[PDB]
Design a protein around this nucleic acid. Sequence first.
DNA 1: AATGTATCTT
DNA 2: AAGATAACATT
Length: 231
Amino acid sequence: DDRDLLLAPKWISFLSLSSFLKQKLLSLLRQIRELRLTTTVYPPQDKLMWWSHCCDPEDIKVVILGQDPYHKGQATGLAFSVDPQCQVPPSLRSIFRELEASVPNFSTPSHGCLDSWARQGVLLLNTVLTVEKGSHELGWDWFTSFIISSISSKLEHCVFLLWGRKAIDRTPLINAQKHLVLTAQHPSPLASLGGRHSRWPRFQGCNHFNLANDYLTRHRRETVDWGLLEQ
DNA sequence: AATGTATCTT
DNA sequence: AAGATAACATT
């Protein structure tokens, strides 16, 4: 039963996975369950497909693609988002800094819960959906690729924000003639250390948020109100 | 000043 | 698979 695939029903329908692939996903989830007896995996099993519960597949406006979940216990299942009682991590600080600098009426919030963006059509996905406490480069690759390939062919006029070189590698999956693809180095401060001589654009000054909104406005779609967050 | 978060090259 | 890099906001 599709209950074991942990995906929200709208997604289980949209993606329309084959029997073969449903068994490949079920085997991976059972492998992660086994791993949890030994080591600690983030996020918890229940919160793996959290991004699928917030965001409806047909409603997607922007696709933000990260590297992998946070590894200090703050991963929520929705990429780069933290719990409202939880302290905003460095990566999320950099995102809020670029929003402050670019978006006109934006003001950085006290809380880091991006649930509001998902309800607005922002898919916060990572290339790998799990992490060992304190890397799972494991076998998620195929599924996150399947999601991107599925969004790119089924939906029209979406924006794909790729951050870091693990995200950038997904570039050939997106149909450039149908959607907008914007690439930048990862928001993490460590991305300013490695890749100081990088040919890829720096996250600081990338202006992805306004650029995405201009594309949506141009294609007569509703914009993302980035500033619509707690406080 | 010390600390805690990728990218590239081998 | 793993080590050098010497960024930078926050503490």
